[PDB]
Amino acid sequence: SETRTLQKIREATQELLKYGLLEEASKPNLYRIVLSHPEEVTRILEPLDLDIGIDEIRGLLYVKVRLDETPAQDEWAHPLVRRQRLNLEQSLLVAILRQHFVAWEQESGTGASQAQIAIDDLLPQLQIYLGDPGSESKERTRLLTLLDQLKGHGLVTSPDAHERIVIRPIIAHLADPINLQALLAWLREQIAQQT
Template structure:
């Protein structure tokens, strides 16, 4: 006869589980959930080519058909997807299909909002007077080239020596040919960083990029002219004041 202590001891011993019982329990347990496959993950994503096109535009500010034809076509074929990506960033895509050009635009600020230069993705580097004047001169060369070769032609070139006398009209002479040349080369190098011109080639020429037609549009050029007039008037007023004090 089994005593009370024998029954208590037997109850506290670990129950031996047979191997077949372990297998049965393993089959019935849910176990770790399988990871979502890569194929299913891609179902809801924006197409890869469209993502790459937007990344290229955000990196350089523009996308040229002549430079990246596949990405250009991908963005143009799915403009709604591109706009969905850019809209939360307060950006939009400008389209110049005649010149084969897509470019990033800052959406117009609403009433009470800051201006475009406050946008966190826009470089806070305003063009100075010398750069703006050179852009205006280059745009004139580009327009003449398009009038002769047709809108959409993208090999507008200008020699460095052609730009020197045109800038002298506005900026005056430095008194040194080497100084004049270095000034133009330095300005061209700065504009190259904005994607407006190519590097100077072996024949001392640069290619003017089509984006210049949008950066130096009539509205911006009118603003530049108004600013120059204000500067001239301010200088004239200052000179008049100095003359009055001397008198």
């Protein structure tokens, strides 16, 4: 009569949805489970228009909005995606983060999600763009506020005791060549009208 999906699959898929992504070094069991039935996963999510990418070389999985039967769309407009779209202020930090991530990867390898940075290093970087309001309290406040927003999108762990943070590797799949290209195009478009 009934054909209950593998309860293990049910656990793994429901967890993965609960967090939007899923990292091996943290929760390897459901991670492997989804690796075991990526097709079943997909068909489970397909009605929802949610689809799973994969990164074995770093130990990651995650959802990403499908683009079918209402072509393309601004993905974020989907009902189920649960947060407000990134905003180029965030993106300004995002680029810096990605730079550090790839730089550390290109010298420690791809064998860990432990790409780390100290908050104070960011300060000069933003200081150039967001300027220098000359009060560490204001700038560091805004810095942590940005970081908070990002952890809301899951990209970066919040500060630890040592004022150091771990970049979540999902960052990489956000700072895509293709997506970066669409972004640079739209940004040059903005430049052309700002002038």
